[PDB]
Amino acid sequence: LVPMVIEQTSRGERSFDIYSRLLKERVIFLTGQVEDHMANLIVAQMLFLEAENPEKDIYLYINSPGGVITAGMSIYDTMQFIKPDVSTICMGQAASMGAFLLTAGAKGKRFCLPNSRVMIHQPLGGYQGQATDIEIHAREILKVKGRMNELMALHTGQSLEQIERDTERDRFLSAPEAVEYGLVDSILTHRN
Amino acid sequence: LVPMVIEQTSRGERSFDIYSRLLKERVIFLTGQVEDHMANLIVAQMLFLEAENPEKDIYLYINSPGGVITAGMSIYDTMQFIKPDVSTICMGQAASMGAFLLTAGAKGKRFCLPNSRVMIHQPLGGYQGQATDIEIHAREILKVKGRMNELMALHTGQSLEQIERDTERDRFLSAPEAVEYGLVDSILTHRN
Amino acid sequence: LPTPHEIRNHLDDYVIGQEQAKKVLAVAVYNHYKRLRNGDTSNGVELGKSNILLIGPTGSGKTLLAETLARLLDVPFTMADATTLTEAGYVGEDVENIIQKLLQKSDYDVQKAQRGIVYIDEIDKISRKSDNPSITRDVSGEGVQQALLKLIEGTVAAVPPQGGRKHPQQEFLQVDTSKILFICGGAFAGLDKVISHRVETGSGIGFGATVKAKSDKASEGELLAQVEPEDLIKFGLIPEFIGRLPVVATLNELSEEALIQILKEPKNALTKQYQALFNLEGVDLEFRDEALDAIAKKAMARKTGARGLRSIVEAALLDTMYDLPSMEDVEKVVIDESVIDGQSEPLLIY
Amino acid sequence: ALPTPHEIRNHLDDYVIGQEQAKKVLAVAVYNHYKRLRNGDTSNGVELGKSNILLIGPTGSGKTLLAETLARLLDVPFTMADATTLTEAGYVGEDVENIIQKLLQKSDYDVQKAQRGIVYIDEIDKISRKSDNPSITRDVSGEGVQQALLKLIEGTVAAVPPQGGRKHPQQEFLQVDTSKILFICGGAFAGLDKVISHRVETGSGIGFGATVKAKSDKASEGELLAQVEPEDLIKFGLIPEFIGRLPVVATLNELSEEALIQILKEPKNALTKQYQALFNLEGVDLEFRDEALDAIAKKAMARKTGARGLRSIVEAALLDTMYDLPSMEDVEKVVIDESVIDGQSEPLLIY
Ligand SMILES: Nc1ncnc2c1ncn2[C@@H]1O[C@H](COP(=O)(O)OP(=O)(O)OP(=O)(O)O)[C@@H](O)[C@H]1O
Ligand SMILES: Nc1ncnc2c1ncn2[C@@H]1O[C@H](COP(=O)(O)OP(=O)(O)OP(=O)(O)O)[C@@H](O)[C@H]1O
Ligand SMILES: [Mg+2]
Secondary structure, three states: OOOEEEEEOOOOEEEEEHHHHHHHOOEEEEEOOEOHHHHHHHHHHHHHHHHHOOOOOEEEEEEEOOEOHHHHHHHHHHHHHOOOOEEEEEEEEEOHHHHHHHHOOOOOOOEEOOOOEEEEOOOOOOOOOOHHHHHHHHHHHHHHHHHHHHHHHHHHOOOHHHHHHHHOOOEEEEHHHHHHHOOOOEEOOOOO | OOOEEEEEOOOOEEEEEHHHHHHOOOEEEEEOOEOHHHHHHHHHHHHHHHHHOOOOOEEEEEEEOOEOHHHHHHHHHHHHHOOOOEEEEEEEEEOHHHHHHHHOOOOOOOEEOOOOEEEEOOOOOOOOOOHHHHHHHHHHHHHHHHHHHHHHHHHHOOOHHHHHHHHOOOEEEEHHHHHHHOOOOEEOOOOO | OOOHHHHHHHHHHHOOOOHHHHHHHHHHHHHHHHHHHOOHHHOOOOOOOOOOEEEOOOOOOHHHHHHHHHHHOOOOEEEEEOOOOOOOOOOOOOOOHHHHHHHHHHOOOHHHHOOOEEEEEOHHHHOOOEOOOOOOOOOOOHHHHHHHHHHHHOOOOOEOOOOOOOOOOOOOEOOOOOOOEEEEEEOOOOHHHHHHHHHOOOOOOOOOOOOOOHHHOOOOOOOHHHOOHHHHHHHOOOHHHHHOOOOOEEOOOOOHHHHHHHHHOOOOOHHHHHHHHHHOOOOEEEEOHHHHHHHHHHHHHHOOOOHHHHHHHHHHOHHHHHHOOOOOOOOEEEEOHHHHHOOOOOEEEO | OOOOHHHHHHHHHHHOOOOHHHHHHHHHHHHHHHHHHHOOHHHOOOOOOOOOEEEEOOOOOOHHHHHHHHHHHOOOOEEEEEOOOOOOOOOOOOOOOHHHHHHHHHOOOOHHHHHOOEEEEEOHHHHOOOOOOOOOEOOOOOHHHHHHHHHHHHOOEEEEOOOOOOOOHHHHOEEEEOOOOEEEEEEOOOOHHHHHHHHHOOOOOOOOOOOOOOOOOOOOHHHHHHOOOHHHHHHHOOOHHHHHHOOEEEEOOOOOHHHHHHHHHOOOOOHHHHHHHHHHOOOOOEEEOHHHHHHHHHHHHHHOOOOHHHHHHHHHHOHHHHHHOOOOOOOOEEEEOHHHHHOOOOOEEEO
């Protein structure tokens, strides 16, 4: 069950779910395994908020263990396409895809909580079939690895070689370590 | 099935679910195994109440057997970030995460029922793969264990060394014993 | 009789930044008198009447245009205000007195009186309103518009004989109102909302749709130009009254460059006014060309038209004026771009 | 000779404490008005224009007090009006032209003095509209009054009865141009602070990136009012044309605890001096401790009534003493202490 809250406006009282009420304030929740259906939902929210106010900044709360790469690219492309700056906040954790979306946020507006845990790894996939087909899928995933690393280097500011070395094996970065790496800009310790 | 209750207001009668009605009074219910999905719901509820009145104190009933660490840290960081003092209450029981969040409440506003059972243990985890990967993941859980023990000492007030020894194995603490340890401040035996 | 170019040239001297509006007024007034010179309409077809509606934002020169136009034309020019006008038989006022005022200016000559012009300022103020229980009756509103509409249709209006004796004596001098130009000018505040609601296409949500940011949403300029009779009816104006006013002169908010000229080009400009004020105290005032740009920028934000300029000058010079009389040996004061921003203080020469 | 602004401000400082900005604006306006009167526009081609002032300020901030004190030193005729009484033309309530009639009385039927005069209109915010929309029904006391003032502020001849308004054909109404009649409109625009906060403060959301102040760190009414712009007044209800007629805008600040303490003794007509004279005529001396005055200021601030709040605290503290003081005998002096304000200790008496 999702709790419902009452919003008071001049028009009159209105009833919203706890998630829709936050959506009214330009807040999108990215939670759980990334996949085609959840990604399309986030894409629809970004476009909807763009029309309402293309000047204000959107917020994205990323707490996910990662997921499909293809679904994540739809979100990344949507963020860079729309004019509003997307602020990414890491709550709990942010795996490979969650981290890629986290660092993909607007320069200067990327935040992370102190006890958050960030993890970045290279893409993983598999194919069963003829050797000829294996060579095709094997080449395709390598392109994704290079393409993803090229984009991470841009946002983080690290060299492509450095990203490749670190992403070869699972690397866990704390909130302060992420600031140095360039994934995020600042930490939200307390309300000021 | 959740029952529906009527609330009498100047505007007129309104129907609310039992959980939403209590949310209006700054009461958040934490129940069951901790996970990313329920954690994001609690986070949204906390932020919503902060906007309505950042001065009034929030209440967080904790009856859970524990769960994922990352999901719990999102709740912990959120409670500390916001201005309102979060008053944690222990109903039935409070496992590792339930206890860590319970003691994380504002000083002087942490409570527990007389027959509640608190339990604290070190993190649990596992990984299967190459030896190199095992070393990476093994170092994280050690940092998490040290980081979680550091925070417990800050709230409870016990020394870091004592927390390590006591948390090495499952330790069950009754409501009065928890007061001496520092996890809670007072017991609610009867309404005065 | 006067050529439109002559009319536009005269107005340009006193009016700045309303070239489009001035063109309509010159053409409209020229065609009106032209029709009066001819008789019988020269054919069965009826030559449409020329009635101007000076709609424009605040401080856009609506009143200035009418007042400056009277100087050029020798014909009698009278100015009235719809606010004072009320239904007949009430303590407020009577609409019929407007004709009598026009006669006083022309010395009660019916011949030249018919060739006069009228300017009813604040016409929008009498816009139709809903009934109020507390108020006894709505004297101001559609009732006043009916009286004014009657004069446009053409009706003889009896006028007392120069304040006759207690006995009426039945003089009732008659003056036809069909040939009398009836200009009505008002700033229709809030009309932009209804006009925008009708011509707003809306913002899409898809990838290929066109998003409209609040910066380029709309402005008073280019919006009032698309005014139609239906939107004016919603404001409260009677449809028949709108139909009787085919000519529509819509003004636009003055631009930065236009405001800069008003600061110095007119003889009675704001800068010259303060210069004379300081000269009365024994000091000379100088305004830099860069300072004028900042003042115009601040005035545009106020949205009060020309009147906004005085606010900026009074604020910037408030501190110096307070201490300047008490101060001694200061012979010259200079204001620059930095002073307008407020970070710097007015420069003083000793 | 011509009084300088500093001299004029000195008089205002004697009666008004803390409103330095209002005094400067008022002094400069009087100085310019005097200069325009000293040298008429006929002297040169230039036609000097006037600038009206809008005295925005909270309750008990000295808006009305400034007008009263100003009349003390104004050699030019001055009069005070009430916007509530004013109504649009054609209604039984009142007419805007009546304002000129009141000013004409002070000049003894002198049109020249009345034309070059100053006028004050208190409670100008009362005639403000409810919302940015013009109206739903006719407003006799609202925008309609503002619509009639437009011609009066800018300048228009005003018809008024010459003497007695009777036995004269057509009443022989006098025509006096109001183009040179300075108009000062002072009002307490309640609720304007939230309007300004809407545009000044942004980002009021629910998330981490939102802005939460908790009502303690929020900007005060005085600070918000200082950032007032004409666009804000449009939402409050003021007509755009009316604002243009009033270019100068003066914002008064909320009286602080220190300012209130000074008002108790520093001004010529202070609250303490008023009660002291009450005791002096009855044969008693009233003494107030320095700490006592500070305590009264804190309590008065909570009331939110500004300077008027001070009177409430003094009345309650001296309620019992005044009731039994006349019955008492051999009373020559009285002293008030900090505890007396709190109510713990009864005020000392000298027998
Ligand atoms: N186009 C302009 N050129 C020069 N001066 C202008 C112009 N428009 C306004 N002004 C200045 O503004 C003052 C008053 O303007 P005016 O009364 O014509 O505005 P308005 O159109 O009547 O506004 P409203 O109808 O809202 O009162 C004049 O003293 C004049 O100097
Ligand atoms: N700045 C001040 N200095 C000294 N006394 C003040 C000041 N402001 C207000 N007072 C006191 O408050 C009383 C009335 O104040 P005043 O009527 O001027 O407030 P106001 O601004 O008119 O309030 P409102 O806006 O509600 O009409 C006076 O008797 C005066 O003693
Ligand atoms: Mg007052």
